[PDB]
């Protein structure tokens, strides 16, 4: 019939924007509760339906490339062919920085992709606006540099020196150094909480609140130096990856790991985790990489193999992933589809960047454009890959063209809605659920032959006599 499209529309919107199963109105016994819950179910149904109908006003289109003939394959496509076939405002972004004498470089974009920071190993830390081509800062620092990271804006950044971390302003003037964070080898900035989480080489993980300036919870990961660290963008829990070959999930409200996904036989070399929090791809020292469903904590498919222990892996805003191993990175497209209940293995990579003798230190996706920045020992190299990048951003959350007034107002609103670090769990939507023990105690204070042998075995050891045990002795004598 003609209403079949209507029922399909409602099923699709209840899948996507529904955020829950539905309230069962037939089991409600109260009359006023029944009509108010029917009113609420009508309002939530039209809410999801109007969001799905207003998903037509999205402006941009997702990029792609598809092979035409039967012999042509997508991984044999050259960057010169992409640059010839693509528009000029996005063919401008395929550059290459040639910085040779100051260590392998480490790239990190800001979370709108306006400014990128690249840090050499021997000290050369620079901060540039890579589309407009101007550099905001460049400074040399002397000693080694473990990791450089932007903070909430492109105003402040944070560099991990030989002992401490240092946070710097937009001009590069050093605001301060953090002395509690010694020998920091990895850093990750939670964006919605204002926490900066640092793994030392000793295995200690410190969460420092950036806004107010006090370290929230120093967790000591009891086993080994950590090899890698990433951050779930959906839970804000930290997937750190150890050297015995397990990845452990950490949160500032517990000193034990939340889960520990057992992984590759050697140490895991790199991790990456989806921005919807669905799946995690990890690459180990044993040459395999493998993906996990995170919402169920099981392995999705068999282990893919990489032909070298992959130094970095970073997955995009859409389904693409760049796994950078040895001296050339490969991009895979369909590793984890959200819609499929049982995942299938991908035969061929989506596209491969060339191996011409520059060992890849770190690959990163520019968060809203369809490019990929590889930081290697010869410097920085930005390549363009069409399928990646979220085509339609939201101007309220994060904006690639944010003016000065919009940046000021957004920083103040993010300060006002910074989340307390005790609001971190495996499921981030728990706020308002039942304390079941407290509800059972409230209802209690409102309404007011195989185990009874191990009972006596446990209570003969106290040796309190405790009249319930006298009743249990009489029961055992009767038995």
């Amino acid at each position: 019939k003609a209403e079949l499209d209507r029922i399909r529309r409602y099923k699709q919107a209840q899948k996507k924007y529904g955020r829950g199963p539905r309230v069962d109105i037939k089991s409600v016994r109260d009359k006023k509760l029944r009509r108010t819950l029917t009113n609420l179910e009508n309002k939530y149904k039209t809410a999801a339906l109007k969001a799905k109908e207003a998903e037509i006003l999205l402006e941009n289109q997702t990029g792609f490339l598809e092979p035409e003939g039967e012999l042509e394959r997508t991984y044999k496509v050259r960057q010169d062919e992409i640059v010839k076939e693509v528009a000029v405002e996005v063919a401008q972004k395929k550059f290459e920085l040639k910085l040779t004498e100051l260590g392998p470089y480490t790239c990190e974009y800001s979370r709108n992709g306006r400014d990128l920071i690249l840090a050499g190993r021997k000290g050369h830390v620079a901060t540039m606006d890579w589309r407009e081509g101007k550099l905001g800062c460049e400074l040399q620092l002397g000693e080694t540099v473990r990791d450089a990271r932007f903070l909430h804006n492109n105003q402040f950044f944070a560099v991990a020196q030989k002992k401490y971390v240092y946070i710097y302003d937009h001009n590069g003037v050093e605001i301060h150094c953090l002395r509690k964070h010694v020998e920091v080898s990895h850093m990750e900035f939670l964006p919605y909480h204002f926490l900066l989480a640092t793994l030392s080489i000793s295995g200690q993980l410190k969460y420092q609140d950036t806004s107010t300036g006090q370290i929230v919870a120093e967790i000591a990961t009891k086993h080994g130096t950590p090899v890698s660290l990433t951050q779930n963008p959906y839970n804000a829990i930290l997937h750190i990856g150890q050297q015995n070959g397990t990845v452990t999930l950490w949160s500032p409200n517990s000193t034990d790991p939340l889960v520990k996904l057992l992984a590759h036989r050697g140490p895991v070399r790199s991790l990456a985790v989806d921005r919807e929090g669905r799946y995690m791809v990890s690459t180990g020292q044993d040459n395999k990489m493998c993906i996990w469903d995170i919402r169920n904590f099981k392995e999705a498919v068999n282990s893919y193999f990489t032909r070298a222990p992959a130094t970095s892996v970073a997955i995009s805003d859409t389904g693409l992933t760049a796994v950078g191993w040895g001296t050339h990175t490969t991009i895979w497209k369909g590793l984890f589809n959200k819609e499929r209940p049982v995942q299938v293995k991908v035969d061929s990579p989506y596209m491969t960047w060339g191996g011409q003798g520059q060992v890849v230190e770190r690959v990163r996706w520019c968060p809203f454009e369809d490019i990929l920045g590889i930081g290697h020992n010869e410097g920085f190299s930005s390549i363009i890959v069409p399928g990646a990048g979220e085509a339609n951003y939201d101007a309220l959350e994060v904006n690639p063209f944010e003016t000065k007034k919009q940046r000021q107002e957004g920083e103040v609103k993010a300060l006002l809605n910074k989340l307390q670090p005790e609001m971190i769990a495996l499921d981030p939507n728990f706020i308002g659920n039942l304390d079941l023990r407290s509800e059972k105690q409230r209802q209690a204070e409102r309404d007011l032959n195989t185990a009874l042998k191990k009972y006596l075995r446990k209570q003969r050891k106290k040796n309190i006599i405790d009249e319930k045990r006298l009743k249990a002795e009489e029961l055992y004598r009767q038995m």
Binding site: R19, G20, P21, R22, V23, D24, S27, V28, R29, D30, K32, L33, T36, L37, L40, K43, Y44, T46, A47, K50, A51, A54, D394, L396, E397, E422, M423, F430, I431, G432, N433, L434, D435, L436, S438, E439, R442
Partner: protein, 58 residues
């Protein structure tokens, strides 16, 4: 401290209440029309003499 200690007054079941909230109110997650219709207040008081009702409406 972010869990709720007991059920609110009209609700009768844990599934009912924890599944009845379920959707964010804010403008980031819902459309503008939905946000207006969901944050309209129940009693809408305009300015003037609010005289008691003269004759039955229904």
């Amino acid at each position: 401290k972010y869990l709720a200690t007991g059920l609110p007054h009209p609700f009768e079941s844990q599934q009912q209440y924890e599944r009845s909230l379920r959707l964010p109110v804010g403008p980031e997650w819902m459309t503008k029309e939905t946000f207006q219709d969901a944050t309209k207040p129940r009693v809408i008081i305009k300015q003037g003499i609010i005289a008691p009702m003269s004759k039955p409406m229904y």
